[PDB]
Amino acid sequence: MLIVTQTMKGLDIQKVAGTWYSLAMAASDISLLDAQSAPLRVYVEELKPTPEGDLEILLQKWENGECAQKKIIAEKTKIPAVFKIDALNENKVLVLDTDYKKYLLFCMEQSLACQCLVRTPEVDDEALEKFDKALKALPMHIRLSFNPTQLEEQCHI
Amino acid sequence: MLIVTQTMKGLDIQKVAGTWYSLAMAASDISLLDAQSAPLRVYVEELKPTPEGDLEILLQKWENGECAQKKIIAEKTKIPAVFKIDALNENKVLVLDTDYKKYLLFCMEQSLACQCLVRTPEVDDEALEKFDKALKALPMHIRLSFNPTQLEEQCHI
Ligand SMILES: CCCCCCCCCCCCCC(=O)O
Numbered sequence: 109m110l111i112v113t114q115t116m117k118g119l120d121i122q123k124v125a126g127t128w129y130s131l132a133m134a135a136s137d138i139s140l141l142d143a144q145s146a147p148l149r150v151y152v153e154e155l156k157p158t159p160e161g162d163l164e165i166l167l168q169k170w171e172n173g174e175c176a177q178k179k180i181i182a183e184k185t186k187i188p189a190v191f192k193i194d195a196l197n198e199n200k201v202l203v204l205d206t207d208y209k210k211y212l213l214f215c216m217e218q219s220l221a222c223q224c225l226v227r228t229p230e231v232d233d234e235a236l237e238k239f240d241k242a243l244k245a246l247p248m249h250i251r252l253s254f255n256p257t258q259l260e261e262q263c264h265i
Numbered sequence: 266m267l268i269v270t271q272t273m274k275g276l277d278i279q280k281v282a283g284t285w286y287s288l289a290m291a292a293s294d295i296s297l298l299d300a301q302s303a304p305l306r307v308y309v310e311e312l313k314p315t316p317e318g319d320l321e322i323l324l325q326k327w328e329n330g331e332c333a334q335k336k337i338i339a340e341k342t343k344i345p346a347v348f349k350i351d352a353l354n355e356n357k358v359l360v361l362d363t364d365y366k367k368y369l370l371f372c373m374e375q376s377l378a379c380q381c382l383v384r385t386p387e388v389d390d391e392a393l394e395k396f397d398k399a400l401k402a403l404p405m406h407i408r409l410s411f412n413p414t415q416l417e418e419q420c421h422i
């Protein structure tokens with residue numbers, strides 16, 4: 109009834125600063141990655157760590173039948189690869205793996221939704237392959253993979 | 266720029282008669298398996314071949330913000346594992362593989378959506394494994410896998 113996955117030790121949050129694109133997503137419940145109504149079908153556009161180690165997130169979200177940019181803050185906690193968001197719901201963010209150059213893997217809160225981010229709007233097989241491997245104990249009932257044209261669009265088409 | 270997949274030769278359509286559940290789905294475009302607005306996010310409930318070899322399909326579909334049962338007819342063609350549907354759009358149906366007992370794999374029409382059907386609302390690893398294998402040249406940007414509770418519900422939750 110249990111399941112485990114590698115995570116980040118030695119995460120220098122300051123190094124994740126910049127522009128990013130959500131290249132893949134997966135969740136354990138199909139509804140979470142719902143195009144209209146699911147608050148985890150979000151497209152990360154920029155990450156902004158603060159001097160003390162909080163994290164400003166710029167993301168897009170379908171809302172009022174349109175793609176919309178939210179500015180969101182995520183507070184640090186005692187674990188540097190885990191953060192928190194008290195918006196409509198209470199949301200924990202967990203970074204699993206990153207080389208800071210190419211890919212960043214993270215998950216969000218019994219139903220998890222995970223993303224593979226990249227710094228350029230191209231597919232990268234390494235990133236995906238590490239996404240697939242990092243997830244493969246988690247049973248993911250939905251998986252989404254975007255193409256390079258979608259990476260540069262309003263909520264990925 | 267090209268891609269190919271095994272299909273059915275020797276398909277006795279009469280043997281696919283009965284109750285079925287859509288256990289998995291995949292498509293090459295993410296939007297096709299859209300919960301609200303995508304006419305391929307359909308849940309097959311019963312197949313009814315006619316004496317001559319047409320195919321009556323009972324499926325569910327989200328519509329007017331609610332799960333709804335459609336009765337749909339699919340005409341045979343010169344290829345017995347390929348059928349046609351002229352509804353709102355023009356839709357070709359292609360059966361890839363079936364043992365008639367356990368699993369039935371089919372695809373529907375540059376964007377394809379494919380399903381793995383089963384006769385009982387349980388997961389079957391064989392069926393999924395043959396689904397995964399039958400698809401794995403097709404590049405599928407979305408993949409959905411349902412659990413046994415969803416198999417017996419209104420549009421799978
Ligand atoms: C390390 C990258 C982390 C990016 C996390 C952003 C995901 C949070 C978006 C959803 C939170 C708000 C949900 C809500 O209150 O409606």
Ligand SMILES: CCCCCCCCCCCCCC(=O)O
Nearest residue numbers: 304307322352353354356358371
């Ligand atoms: C062998 C099993 C085949 C089941 C095929 C049923 C899928 C067709 C449903 C979508 C067709 C209607 C689309 C539309 O006109 O809006």
